[PDB]
Write a structure and sequence with these properties.
This protein is mostly loops and about 15 residues long. The chain has no helix or strand.
């Protein structure tokens, strides 16, 4: 993801694929 990280404060918002 880019907007809202499902995983805690990761960059980029991984944990969504």
């Amino acid at each position: 993801l880019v907007s809202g990280c499902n995983f805690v404060y990761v960059k980029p918002c991984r944990g969504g694929r």
